[PDB]
Scaffold this active site. Sequence first.
Site, PDB file in Angstrom:
ATOM      1  N   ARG A  56      -2.597   0.661   2.382  1.00 43.49           N
ATOM      2  CA  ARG A  56      -2.199  -0.750   2.422  1.00 43.49           C
ATOM      3  C   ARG A  56      -3.186  -1.549   3.267  1.00 43.49           C
ATOM      4  O   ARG A  56      -3.645  -2.624   2.867  1.00 43.49           O
ATOM      5  CB  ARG A  56      -0.795  -0.916   2.997  1.00 43.49           C
ATOM      6  CG  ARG A  56       0.296  -0.330   2.136  1.00 43.49           C
ATOM      7  CD  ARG A  56       1.664  -0.850   2.562  1.00 43.49           C
ATOM      8  NE  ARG A  56       2.680  -0.276   1.687  1.00 43.49           N
ATOM      9  CZ  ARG A  56       3.276   0.894   1.912  1.00 43.49           C
ATOM     10  NH1 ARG A  56       2.972   1.606   3.002  1.00 43.49           N
ATOM     11  NH2 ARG A  56       4.160   1.356   1.035  1.00 43.49           N
ATOM     12  N   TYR A  72      -5.104  -6.189  -9.440  1.00 46.14           N
ATOM     13  CA  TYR A  72      -4.338  -5.253  -8.625  1.00 46.14           C
ATOM     14  C   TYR A  72      -4.922  -3.837  -8.606  1.00 46.14           C
ATOM     15  O   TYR A  72      -5.267  -3.320  -7.543  1.00 46.14           O
ATOM     16  CB  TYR A  72      -2.880  -5.212  -9.110  1.00 46.14           C
ATOM     17  CG  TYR A  72      -2.054  -4.210  -8.343  1.00 46.14           C
ATOM     18  CD1 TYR A  72      -1.381  -4.577  -7.180  1.00 46.14           C
ATOM     19  CD2 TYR A  72      -1.981  -2.878  -8.757  1.00 46.14           C
ATOM     20  CE1 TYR A  72      -0.637  -3.664  -6.470  1.00 46.14           C
ATOM     21  CE2 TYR A  72      -1.245  -1.941  -8.039  1.00 46.14           C
ATOM     22  CZ  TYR A  72      -0.569  -2.336  -6.901  1.00 46.14           C
ATOM     23  OH  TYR A  72       0.168  -1.424  -6.170  1.00 46.14           O
ATOM     24  N   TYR A  76      -7.124  -1.196  -5.485  1.00 46.75           N
ATOM     25  CA  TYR A  76      -6.854   0.164  -5.007  1.00 46.75           C
ATOM     26  C   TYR A  76      -7.983   1.143  -5.281  1.00 46.75           C
ATOM     27  O   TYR A  76      -8.205   2.042  -4.484  1.00 46.75           O
ATOM     28  CB  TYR A  76      -5.465   0.668  -5.451  1.00 46.75           C
ATOM     29  CG  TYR A  76      -4.406  -0.210  -4.818  1.00 46.75           C
ATOM     30  CD1 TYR A  76      -3.854   0.099  -3.572  1.00 46.75           C
ATOM     31  CD2 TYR A  76      -4.039  -1.409  -5.416  1.00 46.75           C
ATOM     32  CE1 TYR A  76      -2.912  -0.752  -2.967  1.00 46.75           C
ATOM     33  CE2 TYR A  76      -3.115  -2.262  -4.821  1.00 46.75           C
ATOM     34  CZ  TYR A  76      -2.549  -1.935  -3.605  1.00 46.75           C
ATOM     35  OH  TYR A  76      -1.648  -2.806  -3.034  1.00 46.75           O
TER      36      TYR A  76
HETATM   37  C1  LIG Z   1      -2.399   3.330  -3.944  1.00 52.24           C
HETATM   38  N1  LIG Z   1      -1.466   2.647  -3.625  1.00 52.24           N
HETATM   39  C2  LIG Z   1      -0.187   1.658  -3.309  1.00 52.24           C
HETATM   40  C3  LIG Z   1       0.903   2.547  -3.930  1.00 52.24           C
HETATM   41  C4  LIG Z   1       2.281   2.322  -3.319  1.00 52.24           C
HETATM   42  C5  LIG Z   1       2.252   2.488  -1.801  1.00 52.24           C
HETATM   43  C6  LIG Z   1       1.214   1.569  -1.147  1.00 52.24           C
HETATM   44  C7  LIG Z   1      -0.174   1.716  -1.767  1.00 52.24           C
END
Ligand SMILES: [C-]#[N+]C1CCCCC1
Lengths: 212, 197
Positions: A56, A72, A76
Site C-alpha cells: 500500500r 489501478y 501495483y
Molecule cells: C497488490 N495489492 C493490493 C491488494 C489488496 C491489499 C493491498 C494491496
Amino acid sequence: MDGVHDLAGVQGFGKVPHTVNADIGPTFHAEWEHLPYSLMFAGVAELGAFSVDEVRYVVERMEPRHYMMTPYYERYVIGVATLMVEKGILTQDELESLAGGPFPLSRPSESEGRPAPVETTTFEVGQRVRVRDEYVPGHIRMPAYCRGRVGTISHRTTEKWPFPDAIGHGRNDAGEEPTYHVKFAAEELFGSDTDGGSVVVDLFEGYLEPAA
Amino acid sequence: ENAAPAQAPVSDRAWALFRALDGKGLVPDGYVEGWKKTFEEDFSPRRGAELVARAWTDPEFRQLLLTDGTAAVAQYGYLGPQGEYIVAVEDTPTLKNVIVCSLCSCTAWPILGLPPTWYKSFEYRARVVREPRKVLSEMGTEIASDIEIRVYDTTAETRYMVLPQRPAGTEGWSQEQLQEIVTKDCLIGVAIPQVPT
Ligand SMILES: [C-]#[N+]C1CCCCC1
Ligand SMILES: [Fe+3]
Ligand SMILES: [Mg+2]
Ligand SMILES: [Mg+2]
Ligand SMILES: [Mg+2]
Ligand SMILES: [Mg+2]
C-alpha cells in the site's frame, strides 16, 4: 502520508463510470492483469520480502502525477517492482532490459515510519473518541478527512494486527492493536457540504484518543 | 511541464517483472496461474449472494452473520485472502449502507469478488464518502431523504458486506431464487435487490 491517494472528499471529479448491475466484463481485461496481485503474494508469502502494508505504501509513494495517470493494476506492477528493487531482489537495470524500455518506479520513502504507539486506550462500544491530531509523513491508515474529528465507537475488533505505520515500512516494532469502527456524522467531516448521513472509518487504536 | 514519464508498454513491464523473478527460481511452478484461477473462479459475489439468501430465510444465521461475520462465512468455507475478518452490515427501512476503500481498493474478495474497475475509480473513491446520495442516484439507485446513508470506508482489516433488505414480492422464494437477485452491487451497497415485474 498526505499524498494524492488520499482522495476521500476531493471535489471536481465527474460521474462514477458505472450504473448498477452493468456488465463489468471479465475479472481481468488484459492478459497481464493478474500479475501484480499474484507477484505481491509471492513477495509476501513465498519470499517474505515485504508486507501487504508495504505494498500500500509503495503505491502511495508513486510520484503524484504518475499516480494520477496510471491505471489501478499498473500502479501495483510499479509498486511490486519497486519493492523488489528496494529489497535487493531485483535491479531496475534488469527490469528495464527485460521490458525493453523505461520502467520508472515509485519514489524513495521520506520517512522511516513510526512504532506502534506506547500509550493507547482500550475503547468500548458507544464511547466518544477523537482521531489524534497528528501528521505522519510515512504510511498511515487514517484518511485526512477524519483527522482531529470526533465520533462514536460501534465495534472493537476481536483480533489485533500490526500497526500499519510501522509494518508499512518493514519495521520490527509494529506490535499489535485492535481497530475500531468509528462512526462520524457527515456534518462532522464536511459541515454543510455533504448529502450523507454517517461515515464509519476503521481506525487503529493508536490513531485514537478519548474525546474531551 | 507536468508530462508523463517515458514508459515501456505496461504488458512488457508486467511480464518483465514476472520473468525477472521467475528466472531466479523465486516463483513456484504454476504459482501466478493458480492465483489467476482463484481470482477468476473462486472469489465470487455468488458466495455473498448465497450468504444473503441464507440470512433472509434463517433468522439464526442472520443473527450470526450480523454479530460474528467471520464465523458465519467460515461455515460455508468462504474465508480467504482479503476476507479473513468479516463484518456484515444490515440495511433497514431507515438505513442504507455502502462500502468503499477511499485509500486504494479494499474489498472482501472471497465473497464479493475482486473489486470492479468503477469501485477503484478516483471518482468513487473521492465522492461516495462525501456525497453518497448523489453518487448512488447517478448510478441508478434512489435513496429517499428519510433513509440515513452510512458509508463504510475500508481503512484497515475489516472486510465488509452489505446485507440488503429483503424486497417485497419474494415471500416463500427458495434460497436459489433469492440468491439470483442479490448481485455484486447489492453486496457493495450501491444497488438494491430487484424483483421482476
Ligand atoms: C497488490 N495489492 C493490493 C491488494 C489488496 C491489499 C493491498 C494491496
Ligand atoms: Fe483498498
Ligand atoms: Mg490530503
Ligand atoms: Mg495474516
Ligand atoms: Mg418476510
Ligand atoms: Mg416456490
